[PDB]
Amino acid sequence: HSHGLFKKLGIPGPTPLPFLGNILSYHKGFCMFDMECHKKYGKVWGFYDGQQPVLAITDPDMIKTVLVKECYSVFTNRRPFGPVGFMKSAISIAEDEEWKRLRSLLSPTFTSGKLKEMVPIIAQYGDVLVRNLRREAETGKPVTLKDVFGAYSMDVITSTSFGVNIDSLNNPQDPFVENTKKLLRFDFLDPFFLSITVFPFLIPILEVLNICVFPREVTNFLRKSVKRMKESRLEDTQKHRVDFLQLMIDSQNSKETESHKALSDLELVAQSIIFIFAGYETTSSVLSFIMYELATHPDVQQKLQEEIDAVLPNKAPPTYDTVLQMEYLDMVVNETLRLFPIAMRLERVCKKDVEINGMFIPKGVVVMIPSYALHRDPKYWTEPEKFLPERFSKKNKDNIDPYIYTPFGSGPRNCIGMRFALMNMKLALIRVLQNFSFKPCKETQIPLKLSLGGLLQPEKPVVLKVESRD
Ligand code: HEM
Ligand SMILES: CC(C)(C)C(=O)Nc1cc(C(F)(F)F)ccc1-n1ccnc1
């Protein structure tokens, strides 16, 4: 049907099969498929997710035109991916004027001033993470990275979102923990999402049956939990709060909002759920990738510890202002996010026929930016498969195009939790690297292989040795 669009436009790409399209080439994952297409078809190519045409662009000026210049007019929304129910109101999934209103109401929640008031909360569980790591390091047994960092990530979320203080690693069956730990990333290559891709006409059938990709038992638990909190926080009003929930509760009074608009009780819960979803498995994945590189590159881990002890002597606790002063820490995070951009791709839907930078894009075509393929392009990065934090030093960081290196996207629809996630991971790294040093063991995959699913995660869970400093 549509499997002749890119042929008439003179656009190269893999030859699509009927019904399926190009989904069969996903057997090596999204990342490998983008790398192969880039090497075989050049600067632009086209493929099909079932019937949906997708045009991949690599020109930085063209990427800027899609993500920045033509955002509000042409490339405003992301691709609909399945039955979302009321989670259609999540700012990541929202569309058109609905997204712009949510982006206006939610942007003051993520200012650097509001984050600084959240720093003492995040640093508290950095000390909790250390204590839980001291107990495991004294056993001498190797530590699974996803477990200790998923627990830290969960501790920060429950406290920064709703002011609920739990030690997730040691209280694993708290009803608040047991449900929030079910908010796992979406494997768009699993049997269900592949079937939704081949049968996109079945999505309206699943929506009327109230079938949601998010667990309905988990969403109901949070909708009732937020309701009880909003009622309870109306009594204990004199306690000044700083968590994400109260910033959204206060923003529900349009008379005190800079946008002169108000948040819905339905929308507020939707963002609270998507904030947990966006921060839980993502923060632990990046922190695990970082610690793998530091352990497999002891010179980088030592130099990072030397900078930390220089900025924070005598195991001084990390603060907001001191984390910004650590540049090699910023270079370790940035270089890891280059090798592992967990978003893999950036997508926008074309709302109307447009010709940008000398190329005609039809209406309804999903324009995709291959972040993983561009982060490892040997044209822009020398020895791209190597972990070299010096690429982001103050000397060479100016040679980095903001549209080739897009770990948090770009434009008005960039990651709204970029500064928070950067501050959260850095606070964890400082406390962890102050007290510990991470070494490989025989059960560590020294040549790290990545999973072939739809998630940018290690094939085998990263496991390392923890040894106490002094
Ligand atoms: C280190 C972890 C994270 C990474 C690598 C990351 C990366 C990204 C990327 C690549 C996008 C797509 C932007 C684009 O389309 O241009 C995005 C969107 C988004 N992220 Fe994150 N993100 C992270 C953590 C978080 C956290 C913790 C939150 C919680 C507040 C969050 C909230 C969002 C939201 C709300 C959007 C969509 C905003 C929009 O629709 O305008 N992210 N993120
Ligand atoms: C695995 C990864 C990183 C690709 C992902 O989980 N992305 C994502 C998807 C959705 C949605 F599909 F449900 F719509 C909402 C929010 C986020 N997100 C996470 C961090 N920053 C934004």
PDB file of all heavy atoms in Angstrom, residues 67 78 91-92 99 103 110 275 278-279 282-283 286 337 342-343 346 348 406-410 412-417 420-421 425, ligand 1:
ATOM      1  N   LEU A  67      13.588  19.478  14.714  1.00  0.00           N
ATOM      2  CA  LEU A  67      13.470  19.509  16.166  1.00  0.00           C
ATOM      3  C   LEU A  67      13.269  20.912  16.724  1.00  0.00           C
ATOM      4  O   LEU A  67      12.714  21.049  17.820  1.00  0.00           O
ATOM      5  CB  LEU A  67      14.710  18.879  16.806  1.00  0.00           C
ATOM      6  CG  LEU A  67      14.930  17.387  16.545  1.00  0.00           C
ATOM      7  CD1 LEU A  67      16.213  16.903  17.202  1.00  0.00           C
ATOM      8  CD2 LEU A  67      13.740  16.576  17.034  1.00  0.00           C
ATOM      9  N   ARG A  78       4.907  13.103  18.636  1.00  0.00           N
ATOM     10  CA  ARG A  78       5.568  11.826  18.425  1.00  0.00           C
ATOM     11  C   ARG A  78       4.579  10.814  17.853  1.00  0.00           C
ATOM     12  O   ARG A  78       3.378  11.069  17.742  1.00  0.00           O
ATOM     13  CB  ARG A  78       6.175  11.310  19.730  1.00  0.00           C
ATOM     14  CG  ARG A  78       7.285  12.189  20.291  1.00  0.00           C
ATOM     15  CD  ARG A  78       7.911  11.574  21.535  1.00  0.00           C
ATOM     16  NE  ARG A  78       9.001  12.391  22.055  1.00  0.00           N
ATOM     17  CZ  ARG A  78       8.860  13.324  22.987  1.00  0.00           C
ATOM     18  NH1 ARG A  78       7.684  13.580  23.536  1.00  0.00           N
ATOM     19  NH2 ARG A  78       9.925  14.018  23.377  1.00  0.00           N
ATOM     20  N   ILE A  91       2.733  14.301  29.297  1.00  0.00           N
ATOM     21  CA  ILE A  91       3.347  15.320  28.448  1.00  0.00           C
ATOM     22  C   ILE A  91       4.190  14.686  27.349  1.00  0.00           C
ATOM     23  O   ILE A  91       4.308  15.242  26.250  1.00  0.00           O
ATOM     24  CB  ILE A  91       4.166  16.305  29.310  1.00  0.00           C
ATOM     25  CG1 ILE A  91       4.793  17.397  28.439  1.00  0.00           C
ATOM     26  CG2 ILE A  91       5.229  15.569  30.114  1.00  0.00           C
ATOM     27  CD1 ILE A  91       5.561  18.436  29.224  1.00  0.00           C
ATOM     28  N   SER A  92       4.773  13.514  27.611  1.00  0.00           N
ATOM     29  CA  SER A  92       5.527  12.822  26.569  1.00  0.00           C
ATOM     30  C   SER A  92       4.611  12.340  25.453  1.00  0.00           C
ATOM     31  O   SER A  92       4.993  12.353  24.277  1.00  0.00           O
ATOM     32  CB  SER A  92       6.299  11.648  27.171  1.00  0.00           C
ATOM     33  OG  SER A  92       7.222  12.091  28.147  1.00  0.00           O
ATOM     34  N   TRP A  99      -0.149  19.472  24.428  1.00  0.00           N
ATOM     35  CA  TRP A  99       1.233  19.394  24.890  1.00  0.00           C
ATOM     36  C   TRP A  99       1.774  20.771  25.257  1.00  0.00           C
ATOM     37  O   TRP A  99       2.458  20.921  26.276  1.00  0.00           O
ATOM     38  CB  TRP A  99       2.125  18.749  23.829  1.00  0.00           C
ATOM     39  CG  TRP A  99       3.578  19.016  24.094  1.00  0.00           C
ATOM     40  CD1 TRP A  99       4.403  18.310  24.919  1.00  0.00           C
ATOM     41  CD2 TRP A  99       4.368  20.086  23.556  1.00  0.00           C
ATOM     42  NE1 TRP A  99       5.659  18.866  24.920  1.00  0.00           N
ATOM     43  CE2 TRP A  99       5.663  19.957  24.092  1.00  0.00           C
ATOM     44  CE3 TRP A  99       4.105  21.136  22.670  1.00  0.00           C
ATOM     45  CZ2 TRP A  99       6.693  20.840  23.775  1.00  0.00           C
ATOM     46  CZ3 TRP A  99       5.130  22.009  22.354  1.00  0.00           C
ATOM     47  CH2 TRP A  99       6.408  21.854  22.902  1.00  0.00           C
ATOM     48  N   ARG A 103       3.457  21.677  28.659  1.00  0.00           N
ATOM     49  CA  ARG A 103       4.842  22.136  28.684  1.00  0.00           C
ATOM     50  C   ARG A 103       4.961  23.506  29.339  1.00  0.00           C
ATOM     51  O   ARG A 103       5.981  23.808  29.967  1.00  0.00           O
ATOM     52  CB  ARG A 103       5.410  22.165  27.264  1.00  0.00           C
ATOM     53  CG  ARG A 103       6.908  22.424  27.192  1.00  0.00           C
ATOM     54  CD  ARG A 103       7.687  21.366  27.957  1.00  0.00           C
ATOM     55  NE  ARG A 103       9.111  21.672  28.031  1.00  0.00           N
ATOM     56  CZ  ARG A 103      10.054  21.037  27.347  1.00  0.00           C
ATOM     57  NH1 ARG A 103       9.762  20.042  26.527  1.00  0.00           N
ATOM     58  NH2 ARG A 103      11.323  21.406  27.496  1.00  0.00           N
ATOM     59  N   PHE A 110      10.721  22.372  36.739  1.00  0.00           N
ATOM     60  CA  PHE A 110      12.060  21.852  36.488  1.00  0.00           C
ATOM     61  C   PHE A 110      13.112  22.951  36.383  1.00  0.00           C
ATOM     62  O   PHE A 110      14.153  22.747  35.752  1.00  0.00           O
ATOM     63  CB  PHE A 110      12.063  20.997  35.221  1.00  0.00           C
ATOM     64  CG  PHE A 110      11.232  19.753  35.328  1.00  0.00           C
ATOM     65  CD1 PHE A 110       9.884  19.773  35.009  1.00  0.00           C
ATOM     66  CD2 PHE A 110      11.799  18.561  35.746  1.00  0.00           C
ATOM     67  CE1 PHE A 110       9.116  18.629  35.107  1.00  0.00           C
ATOM     68  CE2 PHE A 110      11.037  17.414  35.845  1.00  0.00           C
ATOM     69  CZ  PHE A 110       9.694  17.447  35.525  1.00  0.00           C
ATOM     70  N   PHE A 275       6.531  10.769  35.173  1.00  0.00           N
ATOM     71  CA  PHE A 275       7.791  11.164  35.796  1.00  0.00           C
ATOM     72  C   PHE A 275       8.493   9.961  36.414  1.00  0.00           C
ATOM     73  O   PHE A 275       9.717   9.823  36.301  1.00  0.00           O
ATOM     74  CB  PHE A 275       7.548  12.242  36.855  1.00  0.00           C
ATOM     75  CG  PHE A 275       7.143  13.575  36.290  1.00  0.00           C
ATOM     76  CD1 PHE A 275       6.551  14.531  37.099  1.00  0.00           C
ATOM     77  CD2 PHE A 275       7.356  13.875  34.954  1.00  0.00           C
ATOM     78  CE1 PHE A 275       6.178  15.759  36.588  1.00  0.00           C
ATOM     79  CE2 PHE A 275       6.984  15.102  34.437  1.00  0.00           C
ATOM     80  CZ  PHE A 275       6.394  16.044  35.256  1.00  0.00           C
ATOM     81  N   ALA A 278       9.739   7.787  33.455  1.00  0.00           N
ATOM     82  CA  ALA A 278      10.885   8.340  32.742  1.00  0.00           C
ATOM     83  C   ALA A 278      12.161   8.317  33.572  1.00  0.00           C
ATOM     84  O   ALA A 278      13.255   8.371  32.999  1.00  0.00           O
ATOM     85  CB  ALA A 278      10.586   9.772  32.298  1.00  0.00           C
ATOM     86  N   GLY A 279      12.056   8.236  34.895  1.00  0.00           N
ATOM     87  CA  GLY A 279      13.230   8.340  35.738  1.00  0.00           C
ATOM     88  C   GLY A 279      13.703   7.045  36.365  1.00  0.00           C
ATOM     89  O   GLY A 279      14.872   6.931  36.745  1.00  0.00           O
ATOM     90  N   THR A 282      15.575   4.434  33.641  1.00  0.00           N
ATOM     91  CA  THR A 282      16.551   5.185  32.859  1.00  0.00           C
ATOM     92  C   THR A 282      17.758   5.579  33.704  1.00  0.00           C
ATOM     93  O   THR A 282      18.905   5.416  33.275  1.00  0.00           O
ATOM     94  CB  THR A 282      15.897   6.429  32.254  1.00  0.00           C
ATOM     95  OG1 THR A 282      15.321   7.226  33.298  1.00  0.00           O
ATOM     96  CG2 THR A 282      14.812   6.033  31.262  1.00  0.00           C
ATOM     97  N   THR A 283      17.514   6.098  34.910  1.00  0.00           N
ATOM     98  CA  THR A 283      18.612   6.535  35.767  1.00  0.00           C
ATOM     99  C   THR A 283      19.499   5.365  36.170  1.00  0.00           C
ATOM    100  O   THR A 283      20.729   5.491  36.206  1.00  0.00           O
ATOM    101  CB  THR A 283      18.059   7.242  37.004  1.00  0.00           C
ATOM    102  OG1 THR A 283      17.192   8.310  36.600  1.00  0.00           O
ATOM    103  CG2 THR A 283      19.188   7.811  37.850  1.00  0.00           C
ATOM    104  N   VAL A 286      21.743   4.223  33.025  1.00  0.00           N
ATOM    105  CA  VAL A 286      22.896   5.073  32.740  1.00  0.00           C
ATOM    106  C   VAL A 286      23.949   4.923  33.831  1.00  0.00           C
ATOM    107  O   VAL A 286      25.146   4.804  33.547  1.00  0.00           O
ATOM    108  CB  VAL A 286      22.458   6.539  32.576  1.00  0.00           C
ATOM    109  CG1 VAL A 286      23.662   7.420  32.262  1.00  0.00           C
ATOM    110  CG2 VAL A 286      21.405   6.660  31.486  1.00  0.00           C
ATOM    111  N   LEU A 337      26.819   8.789  27.893  1.00  0.00           N
ATOM    112  CA  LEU A 337      25.570   9.009  27.175  1.00  0.00           C
ATOM    113  C   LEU A 337      25.769   9.029  25.666  1.00  0.00           C
ATOM    114  O   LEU A 337      24.818   8.764  24.924  1.00  0.00           O
ATOM    115  CB  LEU A 337      24.919  10.313  27.637  1.00  0.00           C
ATOM    116  CG  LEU A 337      24.232  10.241  29.002  1.00  0.00           C
ATOM    117  CD1 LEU A 337      23.695  11.599  29.421  1.00  0.00           C
ATOM    118  CD2 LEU A 337      23.116   9.207  28.974  1.00  0.00           C
ATOM    119  N   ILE A 342      20.072   5.977  25.691  1.00  0.00           N
ATOM    120  CA  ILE A 342      19.023   4.988  25.921  1.00  0.00           C
ATOM    121  C   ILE A 342      17.762   5.272  25.117  1.00  0.00           C
ATOM    122  O   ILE A 342      16.934   4.372  24.935  1.00  0.00           O
ATOM    123  CB  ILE A 342      18.701   4.904  27.426  1.00  0.00           C
ATOM    124  CG1 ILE A 342      18.313   6.283  27.961  1.00  0.00           C
ATOM    125  CG2 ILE A 342      19.887   4.329  28.193  1.00  0.00           C
ATOM    126  CD1 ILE A 342      18.110   6.319  29.452  1.00  0.00           C
ATOM    127  N   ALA A 343      17.587   6.502  24.629  1.00  0.00           N
ATOM    128  CA  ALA A 343      16.463   6.791  23.750  1.00  0.00           C
ATOM    129  C   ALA A 343      16.661   6.213  22.357  1.00  0.00           C
ATOM    130  O   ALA A 343      15.673   5.991  21.646  1.00  0.00           O
ATOM    131  CB  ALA A 343      16.235   8.298  23.659  1.00  0.00           C
ATOM    132  N   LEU A 346      15.064   9.530  17.959  1.00  0.00           N
ATOM    133  CA  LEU A 346      14.169  10.655  18.186  1.00  0.00           C
ATOM    134  C   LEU A 346      13.205  10.733  17.012  1.00  0.00           C
ATOM    135  O   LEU A 346      13.634  10.700  15.855  1.00  0.00           O
ATOM    136  CB  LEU A 346      14.950  11.965  18.329  1.00  0.00           C
ATOM    137  CG  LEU A 346      16.030  12.017  19.412  1.00  0.00           C
ATOM    138  CD1 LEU A 346      16.863  13.281  19.273  1.00  0.00           C
ATOM    139  CD2 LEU A 346      15.411  11.934  20.799  1.00  0.00           C
ATOM    140  N   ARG A 348       9.473  12.416  15.205  1.00  0.00           N
ATOM    141  CA  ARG A 348       8.468  13.463  15.087  1.00  0.00           C
ATOM    142  C   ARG A 348       7.553  13.130  13.917  1.00  0.00           C
ATOM    143  O   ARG A 348       8.009  12.600  12.900  1.00  0.00           O
ATOM    144  CB  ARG A 348       9.100  14.847  14.866  1.00  0.00           C
ATOM    145  CG  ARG A 348       9.988  15.353  15.995  1.00  0.00           C
ATOM    146  CD  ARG A 348       9.197  15.655  17.256  1.00  0.00           C
ATOM    147  NE  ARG A 348      10.001  16.382  18.231  1.00  0.00           N
ATOM    148  CZ  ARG A 348      10.835  15.814  19.091  1.00  0.00           C
ATOM    149  NH1 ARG A 348      11.000  14.502  19.131  1.00  0.00           N
ATOM    150  NH2 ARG A 348      11.523  16.582  19.932  1.00  0.00           N
ATOM    151  N   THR A 406      22.705  14.166  20.713  1.00  0.00           N
ATOM    152  CA  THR A 406      21.384  14.471  21.263  1.00  0.00           C
ATOM    153  C   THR A 406      20.954  13.363  22.217  1.00  0.00           C
ATOM    154  O   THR A 406      20.026  12.599  21.925  1.00  0.00           O
ATOM    155  CB  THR A 406      20.351  14.649  20.149  1.00  0.00           C
ATOM    156  OG1 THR A 406      20.320  13.472  19.332  1.00  0.00           O
ATOM    157  CG2 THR A 406      20.691  15.851  19.284  1.00  0.00           C
ATOM    158  N   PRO A 407      21.604  13.253  23.380  1.00  0.00           N
ATOM    159  CA  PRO A 407      21.163  12.242  24.352  1.00  0.00           C
ATOM    160  C   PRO A 407      19.848  12.603  25.015  1.00  0.00           C
ATOM    161  O   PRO A 407      19.106  11.703  25.428  1.00  0.00           O
ATOM    162  CB  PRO A 407      22.316  12.205  25.360  1.00  0.00           C
ATOM    163  CG  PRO A 407      22.864  13.590  25.324  1.00  0.00           C
ATOM    164  CD  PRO A 407      22.718  14.066  23.898  1.00  0.00           C
ATOM    165  N   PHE A 408      19.539  13.895  25.131  1.00  0.00           N
ATOM    166  CA  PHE A 408      18.280  14.366  25.691  1.00  0.00           C
ATOM    167  C   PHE A 408      17.404  15.039  24.639  1.00  0.00           C
ATOM    168  O   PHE A 408      16.547  15.859  24.982  1.00  0.00           O
ATOM    169  CB  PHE A 408      18.541  15.324  26.854  1.00  0.00           C
ATOM    170  CG  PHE A 408      19.294  14.704  27.996  1.00  0.00           C
ATOM    171  CD1 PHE A 408      20.671  14.823  28.081  1.00  0.00           C
ATOM    172  CD2 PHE A 408      18.623  14.006  28.987  1.00  0.00           C
ATOM    173  CE1 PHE A 408      21.365  14.254  29.133  1.00  0.00           C
ATOM    174  CE2 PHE A 408      19.312  13.434  30.041  1.00  0.00           C
ATOM    175  CZ  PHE A 408      20.685  13.559  30.113  1.00  0.00           C
ATOM    176  N   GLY A 409      17.605  14.707  23.366  1.00  0.00           N
ATOM    177  CA  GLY A 409      16.859  15.361  22.315  1.00  0.00           C
ATOM    178  C   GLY A 409      17.260  16.822  22.170  1.00  0.00           C
ATOM    179  O   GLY A 409      18.318  17.265  22.629  1.00  0.00           O
ATOM    180  N   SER A 410      16.381  17.579  21.518  1.00  0.00           N
ATOM    181  CA  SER A 410      16.615  18.997  21.291  1.00  0.00           C
ATOM    182  C   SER A 410      15.297  19.661  20.922  1.00  0.00           C
ATOM    183  O   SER A 410      14.328  18.994  20.548  1.00  0.00           O
ATOM    184  CB  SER A 410      17.660  19.227  20.193  1.00  0.00           C
ATOM    185  OG  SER A 410      17.894  20.609  19.992  1.00  0.00           O
ATOM    186  N   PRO A 412      11.924  22.383  21.529  1.00  0.00           N
ATOM    187  CA  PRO A 412      10.922  22.569  22.593  1.00  0.00           C
ATOM    188  C   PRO A 412      10.425  21.273  23.213  1.00  0.00           C
ATOM    189  O   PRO A 412       9.819  21.324  24.290  1.00  0.00           O
ATOM    190  CB  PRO A 412       9.784  23.312  21.878  1.00  0.00           C
ATOM    191  CG  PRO A 412      10.426  23.935  20.678  1.00  0.00           C
ATOM    192  CD  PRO A 412      11.492  22.974  20.253  1.00  0.00           C
ATOM    193  N   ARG A 413      10.651  20.121  22.580  1.00  0.00           N
ATOM    194  CA  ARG A 413      10.229  18.835  23.126  1.00  0.00           C
ATOM    195  C   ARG A 413      11.407  18.018  23.650  1.00  0.00           C
ATOM    196  O   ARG A 413      11.359  16.785  23.659  1.00  0.00           O
ATOM    197  CB  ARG A 413       9.450  18.029  22.087  1.00  0.00           C
ATOM    198  CG  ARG A 413       8.147  18.669  21.657  1.00  0.00           C
ATOM    199  CD  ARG A 413       7.084  17.634  21.317  1.00  0.00           C
ATOM    200  NE  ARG A 413       6.622  16.892  22.485  1.00  0.00           N
ATOM    201  CZ  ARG A 413       5.496  16.191  22.530  1.00  0.00           C
ATOM    202  NH1 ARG A 413       4.677  16.131  21.493  1.00  0.00           N
ATOM    203  NH2 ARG A 413       5.181  15.538  23.645  1.00  0.00           N
ATOM    204  N   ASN A 414      12.468  18.688  24.091  1.00  0.00           N
ATOM    205  CA  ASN A 414      13.596  17.984  24.678  1.00  0.00           C
ATOM    206  C   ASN A 414      13.203  17.396  26.032  1.00  0.00           C
ATOM    207  O   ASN A 414      12.101  17.615  26.543  1.00  0.00           O
ATOM    208  CB  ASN A 414      14.800  18.917  24.821  1.00  0.00           C
ATOM    209  CG  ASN A 414      14.473  20.193  25.583  1.00  0.00           C
ATOM    210  OD1 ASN A 414      13.471  20.274  26.294  1.00  0.00           O
ATOM    211  ND2 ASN A 414      15.325  21.201  25.433  1.00  0.00           N
ATOM    212  N   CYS A 415      14.127  16.637  26.617  1.00  0.00           N
ATOM    213  CA  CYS A 415      13.875  16.040  27.922  1.00  0.00           C
ATOM    214  C   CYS A 415      13.707  17.126  28.973  1.00  0.00           C
ATOM    215  O   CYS A 415      14.641  17.885  29.248  1.00  0.00           O
ATOM    216  CB  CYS A 415      15.017  15.102  28.306  1.00  0.00           C
ATOM    217  SG  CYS A 415      14.851  14.417  29.968  1.00  0.00           S
ATOM    218  N   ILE A 416      12.510  17.200  29.560  1.00  0.00           N
ATOM    219  CA  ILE A 416      12.242  18.195  30.592  1.00  0.00           C
ATOM    220  C   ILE A 416      12.906  17.849  31.916  1.00  0.00           C
ATOM    221  O   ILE A 416      12.997  18.711  32.797  1.00  0.00           O
ATOM    222  CB  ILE A 416      10.720  18.373  30.779  1.00  0.00           C
ATOM    223  CG1 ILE A 416      10.392  19.828  31.118  1.00  0.00           C
ATOM    224  CG2 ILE A 416      10.191  17.440  31.861  1.00  0.00           C
ATOM    225  CD1 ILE A 416       8.911  20.121  31.197  1.00  0.00           C
ATOM    226  N   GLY A 417      13.382  16.616  32.073  1.00  0.00           N
ATOM    227  CA  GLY A 417      14.077  16.214  33.280  1.00  0.00           C
ATOM    228  C   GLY A 417      15.565  16.028  33.071  1.00  0.00           C
ATOM    229  O   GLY A 417      16.202  15.234  33.770  1.00  0.00           O
ATOM    230  N   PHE A 420      17.575  17.519  36.066  1.00  0.00           N
ATOM    231  CA  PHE A 420      17.317  16.685  37.235  1.00  0.00           C
ATOM    232  C   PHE A 420      18.061  15.360  37.137  1.00  0.00           C
ATOM    233  O   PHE A 420      18.746  14.948  38.081  1.00  0.00           O
ATOM    234  CB  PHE A 420      15.814  16.448  37.394  1.00  0.00           C
ATOM    235  CG  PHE A 420      15.465  15.506  38.514  1.00  0.00           C
ATOM    236  CD1 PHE A 420      15.263  15.980  39.799  1.00  0.00           C
ATOM    237  CD2 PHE A 420      15.341  14.144  38.282  1.00  0.00           C
ATOM    238  CE1 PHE A 420      14.946  15.116  40.830  1.00  0.00           C
ATOM    239  CE2 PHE A 420      15.028  13.277  39.308  1.00  0.00           C
ATOM    240  CZ  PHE A 420      14.828  13.764  40.584  1.00  0.00           C
ATOM    241  N   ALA A 421      17.930  14.671  35.999  1.00  0.00           N
ATOM    242  CA  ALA A 421      18.587  13.377  35.840  1.00  0.00           C
ATOM    243  C   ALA A 421      20.102  13.516  35.913  1.00  0.00           C
ATOM    244  O   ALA A 421      20.783  12.655  36.483  1.00  0.00           O
ATOM    245  CB  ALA A 421      18.168  12.732  34.519  1.00  0.00           C
ATOM    246  N   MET A 425      22.134  11.604  38.925  1.00  0.00           N
ATOM    247  CA  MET A 425      23.179  10.616  38.681  1.00  0.00           C
ATOM    248  C   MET A 425      24.526  11.087  39.214  1.00  0.00           C
ATOM    249  O   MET A 425      25.328  10.276  39.692  1.00  0.00           O
ATOM    250  CB  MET A 425      23.276  10.309  37.187  1.00  0.00           C
ATOM    251  CG  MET A 425      22.017   9.704  36.595  1.00  0.00           C
ATOM    252  SD  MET A 425      22.174   9.378  34.831  1.00  0.00           S
ATOM    253  CE  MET A 425      22.654  10.997  34.227  1.00  0.00           C
TER     254      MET A 425
HETATM  255  C1  HEM B   1      19.483  10.044  32.237  1.00  0.00           C
HETATM  256  C2  HEM B   1      18.188   9.809  32.001  1.00  0.00           C
HETATM  257  C3  HEM B   1      17.362  10.390  30.837  1.00  0.00           C
HETATM  258  C4  HEM B   1      17.647  10.437  29.528  1.00  0.00           C
HETATM  259  C5  HEM B   1      18.923   9.907  28.818  1.00  0.00           C
HETATM  260  C6  HEM B   1      16.533  11.092  28.845  1.00  0.00           C
HETATM  261  C7  HEM B   1      16.426  11.343  27.490  1.00  0.00           C
HETATM  262  C8  HEM B   1      15.273  11.856  26.895  1.00  0.00           C
HETATM  263  C9  HEM B   1      15.065  12.017  25.473  1.00  0.00           C
HETATM  264  C10 HEM B   1      16.098  11.638  24.400  1.00  0.00           C
HETATM  265  C11 HEM B   1      13.844  12.538  25.271  1.00  0.00           C
HETATM  266  C12 HEM B   1      13.223  12.874  23.891  1.00  0.00           C
HETATM  267  C13 HEM B   1      13.349  14.358  23.577  1.00  0.00           C
HETATM  268  C14 HEM B   1      13.118  14.596  22.119  1.00  0.00           C
HETATM  269  O1  HEM B   1      12.074  14.072  21.618  1.00  0.00           O
HETATM  270  O2  HEM B   1      13.650  15.602  21.570  1.00  0.00           O
HETATM  271  C15 HEM B   1      13.224  12.732  26.569  1.00  0.00           C
HETATM  272  C16 HEM B   1      11.954  13.256  26.789  1.00  0.00           C
HETATM  273  C17 HEM B   1      11.389  13.488  28.012  1.00  0.00           C
HETATM  274  N1  HEM B   1      11.949  13.204  29.254  1.00  0.00           N
HETATM  275 FE1  HEM B   1      13.792  12.351  29.557  1.00  0.00          FE
HETATM  276  N2  HEM B   1      15.589  11.424  29.795  1.00  0.00           N
HETATM  277  C18 HEM B   1      16.055  11.013  31.025  1.00  0.00           C
HETATM  278  C19 HEM B   1      15.412  11.158  32.235  1.00  0.00           C
HETATM  279  C20 HEM B   1      14.214  11.772  32.481  1.00  0.00           C
HETATM  280  C21 HEM B   1      13.612  11.940  33.783  1.00  0.00           C
HETATM  281  C22 HEM B   1      14.243  11.448  35.091  1.00  0.00           C
HETATM  282  C23 HEM B   1      12.446  12.585  33.624  1.00  0.00           C
HETATM  283  C24 HEM B   1      11.424  13.000  34.698  1.00  0.00           C
HETATM  284  C25 HEM B   1      10.965  14.242  34.840  1.00  0.00           C
HETATM  285  C26 HEM B   1      12.282  12.842  32.217  1.00  0.00           C
HETATM  286  C27 HEM B   1      11.226  13.481  31.597  1.00  0.00           C
HETATM  287  C28 HEM B   1      11.062  13.588  30.236  1.00  0.00           C
HETATM  288  C29 HEM B   1       9.907  14.133  29.575  1.00  0.00           C
HETATM  289  C30 HEM B   1       8.687  14.672  30.351  1.00  0.00           C
HETATM  290  C31 HEM B   1      10.084  14.082  28.254  1.00  0.00           C
HETATM  291  C32 HEM B   1       9.101  14.553  27.171  1.00  0.00           C
HETATM  292  C33 HEM B   1       8.955  16.067  27.233  1.00  0.00           C
HETATM  293  C34 HEM B   1       8.257  16.600  26.002  1.00  0.00           C
HETATM  294  O3  HEM B   1       7.335  15.880  25.532  1.00  0.00           O
HETATM  295  O4  HEM B   1       8.363  17.831  25.718  1.00  0.00           O
HETATM  296  N3  HEM B   1      13.370  12.336  31.553  1.00  0.00           N
HETATM  297  N4  HEM B   1      14.122  12.301  27.531  1.00  0.00           N
END
